[PDB]
Ligand binder design. Structure first.
Ligand SMILES: Nc1ncnc2c1ncn2[C@@H]1O[C@H](CSSCc2cccc([N+](=O)[O-])c2)[C@@H](O)[C@H]1O
Ligand SMILES: Nc1ncnc2c1ncn2[C@@H]1O[C@H](CSSCc2cccc([N+](=O)[O-])c2)[C@@H](O)[C@H]1O
Lengths: 276, 272
């Protein structure tokens, strides 16, 4: 497969991107991987820009809607995605087919640890097995020096660090802070599914979290009650969970995580919390 | 700084990071890294794996010795001209206990997975780890554990691992008995009866010109002629351990208990 530096090169075949990545590493370029499900927004572009700033980097952005972590409802805009990558000066997009990634269906897979059964995994007990299986595959195909994930999906980031540690993967996991709208709303491809009213109410998630982070000088109870009060004051926000955990998602430094529904649209957000 | 490596000597590393660093450094110097996973207690069967790895031009041979949850073994490797032994502790391999693991496909529940339903999840997890630590160009496994070999091929294909899996033919005693450290536990009567596994398989392989049923019936007759041999299974499958096709290549696998000693063997079969 051909590779043209300073241009966007799109490969669909795992063998092609593997070959190009290997070649590029051999010539001294450091391979950065940004796994995505497409429908790219500024949150994804922050990942790309973090990748870019690593000197000598070549940036691979994968776009794959992984059926195993689910599907028909997921936003798909491939045209726009590659345009954005071109604008960002990304040199490699990897856009594999389902058949190329899963020629044998679900055969060997990744079994995450107990964290996958909790929070996002509570009602979706196979979700993270899906995510970790695909991320492992992407990591083996691309063999990046570093792989970039958003903090917005904090439990996912934690589990990917677990995958990496547990399987001795020779990749550094880089967590990138959540990119937010002007009012604080965490950027998400799911935000498009909010009407004007729901969009207005949705600010309560980030407002609750930031209120909690500042309340936290008064202790964990204060922080949680501050967040709960903001969410309770929000018209038509239905809370699935609001949980304060250790940073590894098992007191002093923690992470406060929220998941809520606005209509049918389920939103997530989380924030660093320092107690005292 | 990259850990010390002395060419032509047995270099022993216990730290995963150390062997990772040396393997990476060596491959950059134009060596091809060969991995031979073992559980120690080495015999000629394991040496055959080592010798296969050694004959690859440019090879550096990494033999791991690890029991999934010594000086004699090292002497044998030294004598084989192996340059790297990797001897990690359980704590070094599992610093966070069992957390993320590999879930094999359904083949792992069959055959050997009958009595041991989680056995292969353990093997694939540790093999995946060793692969990621050492990043070998090729990894060597004996055909004696054929189902394990097939499952490792599935692991490598399924997770897109960039390693060649090399199956090495089973090394046998003079009478055909597959070499295994367990053979030592057999008393004379049991050791004599144990020959029936290999004899049954080789009979089947030659009977196979007359078809699959002839091959199975020949093997069963041989096993039926042996006292104190409790057959756990005797199965003819295709080479990937799916159902046997009407003709073509297959594999015949047997497992049996002699007292408390469980023995396995298997053989290539060509049907008709
Ligand atoms: N507002 C935001 N700010 C920062 N990062 C954000 C973000 N919104 C999303 N992201 C970040 O953009 C990425 C979204 S997809 S990457 C995870 C994944 C899961 C399953 C399958 C596959 N896959 O097939 O490659 C990949 C996440 O890293 C998210 O945390
Ligand atoms: N007679 C024989 N002939 C050829 N190969 C033989 C053999 N006897 C044994 N072997 C071969 O010697 C190797 C034995 S150990 S490698 C598999 C394993 C299992 C569990 C845990 C771990 N682990 O913690 O790294 C590794 C196999 O490749 C076997 O097929």
């Amino acid at each position: 497969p051909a590779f043209h530096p300073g241009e966007l090169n799109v490969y669909s075949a795992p063998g092609d991107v593997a070959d190009v990545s290997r070649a590029l590493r051999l010539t001294g370029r450091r391979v950065m991987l940004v796994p995505t499900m497409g429908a790219l927004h500024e949150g994804h572009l922050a990942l790309v820009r973090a990748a870019k700033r690593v000197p000598g980097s070549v940036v691979v952005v994968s776009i794959f809607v992984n059926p195993m972590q689910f599907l028909d409802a997921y936003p798909r805009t491939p045209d726009d995605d590659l345009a954005q990558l071109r604008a960002e000066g990304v040199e490699i997009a990897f856009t594999p087919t389902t058949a190329a990634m899963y020629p044998d269906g679900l055969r060997t897979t990744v079994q995450p640890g107990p964290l996958a059964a909790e929070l996002e995994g509570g009602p979706r007990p196979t979700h993270f097995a899906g995510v970790l299986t695909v991320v492992l595959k992407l990591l083996q195909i691309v063999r990046p020096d570093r792989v970039f994930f958003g903090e917005k999906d904090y439990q996912q980031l934690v589990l990917i660090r677990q995958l990496v540690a547990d399987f001795n993967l020779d990749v550094a996991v880089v967590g990138v802070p959540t990119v937010r709208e002007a009012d604080g709303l965490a950027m998400s491809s799911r935000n498009r599914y909010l009407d004007p009213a729901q969009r207005a109410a949705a600010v309560a998630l980030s407002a609750a979290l930031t209120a909690a982070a500042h309340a936290a000088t008064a202790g964990a109870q204060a922080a949680l009650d501050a967040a709960r009060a903001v969410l309770d004051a929000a018209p038509g926000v239905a809370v699935d969970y609001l949980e304060l955990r250790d940073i590894g998602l098992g007191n002093g430094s923690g992470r406060l995580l929220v998941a809520a529904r606005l209509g049918t649209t389920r939103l997530l957000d989380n924030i660093a919390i320092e107690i005292g």
